[PDB]
Amino acid sequence: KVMEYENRIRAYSTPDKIFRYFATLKVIEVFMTPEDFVRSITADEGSIFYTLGECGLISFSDYIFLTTVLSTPQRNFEIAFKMFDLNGDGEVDMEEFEQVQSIIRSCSALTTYFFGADLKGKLTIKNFLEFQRKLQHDVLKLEFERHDPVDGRITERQFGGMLLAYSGVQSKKLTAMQRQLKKHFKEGKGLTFQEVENFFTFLKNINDVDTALSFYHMAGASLDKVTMQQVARTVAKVELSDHVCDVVFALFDCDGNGELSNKEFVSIMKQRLM
Amino acid sequence: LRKQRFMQFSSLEHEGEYYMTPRDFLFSVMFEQMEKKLTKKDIEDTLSGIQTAGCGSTFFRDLGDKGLISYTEYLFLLTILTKPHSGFHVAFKMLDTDGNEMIEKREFFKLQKIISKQDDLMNTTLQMRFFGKRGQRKLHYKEFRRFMENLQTEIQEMEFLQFSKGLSFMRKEDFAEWLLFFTNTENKDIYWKNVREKLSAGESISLDEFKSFCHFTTHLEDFAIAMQMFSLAHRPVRLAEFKRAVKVATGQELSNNILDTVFKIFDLDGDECLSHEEFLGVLKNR
Ligand SMILES: [Ca+2]
Ligand SMILES: [Ca+2]
Ligand SMILES: [Ca+2]
Ligand SMILES: [Ca+2]
């Protein structure tokens, strides 16, 4: 019951309650060890949370910033960086970041990682995009290896579980089809990490995929595998394997017509982005 | 039910297929609800009319009644009317499947028509322009982009001129009326009170300012994801903040006249600085 409670306050309660619920260290103000951040959603060298595992801990400004970095597409993150840049020089400093941090609140980890030890550094667009990329990647890698993989491959039931967990909608029909995903693939050839990461990269760019798919929406047409792969390769620069769209069509196609309509797939994964 | 609107407005008839003359497409996009025969002379009319009208922003107006618009051209134009500029390129890429940086006739003509037919069962002007008189030339990106932008500018000119009572300048009262019709929120008399008590008999609104506000209106989702920062902190937006915000998130630079007008209209709390509830919570309609 208390796990369901924390799941629901993760679902709809304010991040003010969530950070104050998962933080462990208080100062003068409360701080969270990065492990509380990997817990709030769910490290040897190369991992992100070790390069951020050095002193100190994560403030409330750093928590909100991380959550809005994870839940934002790329070409909107570029506009966000341009918004940060008050002076319009093209390189963000610590002062503008401090201003928007104050606005957020109404620390070492984030600001010493970004602007260096003495904070005297200045940011650019490439470091910002690369930080977002590494964050999302090493969140996904832990989400993946969390499912007890075997030979670096997960079965399609667990991949369907991941998909419906991300979708944020749980209905008995969809859960039944998720269970049936085992019956559909009696042998199973697993799902590597690359295919899963590629599909979630496709899912992050869904609000642009929808714009590129407007003729199919107005004409009333539906989405088969080939057009899904084409729009993925054109919009999200991803190479959707045949097996990932196989599983997606076996999962989200409730009416069994063989093809996804706008209300079946794109609307769900678009409104999940809110 | 787009086929219903189309078959209603269409005027020329050939073997169960109903074609529009261009002056019917203009009416279809301008007028919401308002109030036959085709022959080979009409065919030759449409064959000849492509040369008379220039390829500029005034294409359809100069065409007039000498043209042909199939159903798929109608649906394609409807699609290309509300394209945020960032999407322009991707649309091209979705037609160019072989990737030769060009749209062959059979590259798109078979494609849109074939998906129309497939969802159904289960020489027109635009084609004569995109592929010459004989239907053999090719399309590139620059002409496609110029055509999209010219169509959008033409619909914007026609809106401005319809709402300004044929004159060279709207008045701020008339643009306020346009905005209220556009947000479909004329019901609330508070906006009429504001426009009656604060928008004096004064400055006008030229064509470029209205065009800039329109181009801003089509990029509204980027603006929303730009202002979500202020939204999650519950902060009102001053005028300078809003002007720089539109300039950055949509690239379009809004004049001070239009922004003054919007701030005067949508100021319910009377603070001289908008908030999320009073502007974006309303323009979610668009
Ligand atoms: Ca700067
Ligand atoms: Ca279906
Ligand atoms: Ca081609
Ligand atoms: Ca206000």
Residue numbers in the entry:
A (entry chain I): 110 to 137, 144 to 157, 189 to 252, 275 to 442
B (entry chain J): 85 to 119, 125 to 211, 231 to 394
What is written in the article reporting this PDB entry?
The side of the heterodimer that associates with the nanodisc is the same as the one that faces the channel. The structure reveals a substantial conformational change upon Ca2+ binding that makes the heterodimer more compact and markedly more bent between MICU1 and MICU2. Ca2+ dependent rearrangements of the EF-hand motifs that involve their helix turn helix elements produce this bend. Superimposing the Ca2+-bound MICU1-MICU2 structure on the UID in the resting holocomplex reveals that the Ca2+-induced conformational changes in the heterodimer would place hydrophilic regions of MICU2 within the membrane, which would be highly unfavorable thermodynamically (middle). Rather than inserting into the membrane, we hypothesize that the bending motion of MICU1-MICU2 acts like a lever against the membrane to pry MICU1 from the mouth of the pore when [Ca2+]IMS is elevated. The conformational changes would dislodge the UID from the blocking conformation, which would allow Ca2+ ions to permeate though the channel while [Ca2+]IMS remains elevated.
The protein MCU constitutes the pore of the uniporter through which Ca2+ ions flow and EMRE, a small transmembrane protein that associates with MCU, is necessary for Ca2+ uptake in metazoan organisms. At the ~100 nM resting level of [Ca2+]cytosol, MICU1-MICU2 and MICU1-MICU3 heterodimers prevent ion conduction through the channel, and they permit it when Ca2+ levels rise.
